Amino acid sequence: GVLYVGSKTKEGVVHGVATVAENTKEQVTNVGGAVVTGVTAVAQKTVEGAGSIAAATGFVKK
Amino acid sequence: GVLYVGSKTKEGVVHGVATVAENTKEQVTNVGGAVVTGVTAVAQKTVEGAGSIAAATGFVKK
């Protein structure tokens, strides 16, 4: 299928995932997987297959 | 006289005079004279003398 997408922007500043942490014991920032953060962010047919994306963190501290 | 001034800033972005103009016939931006636009902007005894600062524009179009 056609996905024509016309974005004419005068001016644009786009910020993706932001990680800010102050006065933290132990810090683990988890950013990854499938993230698209452009001015014209277009994503299609992501993992149309069997597999899938997974962004997971392994902090336990038992 | 004493003018102790203690400014401890975590983070600061300061913008001076801003000139934005779109679709203008004839443009004359006049920024000058005595302008101080720092993070810690301190001005004292400006033209304590006879003279004075003057920021003037000479547009007539008669």
Numbering used by the authors:
A (entry chain C), B (entry chain A): 36 to 97
From the reporting publication:
WES identified a novel heterozygous missense variant in SNCA (NM_000345.4, cDNA 174G>C; protein K58N). As previously reported, WT a-Syn fibrils adopted two similarly populated conformations, consisting of one (1PF) or two protofilaments (2PF) respectively. In contrast, K58N adopted almost exclusively 2PF conformations. An atomic model based on the 3D reconstruction of these fibrils at 3.7 Å global resolution revealed a similar protofilament fold as in WT fibrils. However, K58N fibrils present a higher twist (−1.29 degrees vs −0.81 degrees in WT fibrils), and a slightly shifted protofilament interface, possibly due to the proximity of the mutation site (K58) to the interface stabilizing residue (E57). Additionally, no density for residues 14–25 was visible at the periphery of mutant fibrils. The findings from cryo-EM data revealed that the K58N mutation preferentially results in 2PF fibrils with a similar protofilament fold than WT fibrils, suggesting that the mutation stabilizes the WT inter-protofilament interface. In WT, K58 may form a salt bridge in cis with E57, which could destabilize the inter-protofilament interface and thereby favour 1PF structures. In contrast, the K58N mutation may prevent this interaction due to the altered charge properties, thereby promoting trans interactions with K45 of an adjacent protofilament and thus favoring in 2PF fibrils. Altogether, these results indicate that the main effect of these mutations in fibril architecture is the modulation of the WT conformational landscape, favoring either 1PF (G14R) or 2PF (K58N) forms.
Mutations and multiplications in the SNCA gene, encoding alpha-synuclein (aSyn), are associated with familial forms of Parkinson’s disease (PD). aSyn, an intrinsically disordered protein, has been a significant focus of neuroscience research not only due to its central role in PD and related synucleinopathies, but also because of its abundance and function in the nervous system. aSyn is primarily concentrated in the presynaptic terminals of neurons, but is also present in other cellular compartments including the nucleus, and is thought to interact with membranes adopting helical conformations and tetrameric structures. In pathological conditions, aSyn is thought to misfold and accumulate, forming pathological aggregates that disrupt cellular homeostasis, in a process that may ultimately cause neuronal cell death. A central pathological hallmark in PD and other synucleinopathies is the accumulation of aSyn into insoluble aggregates.
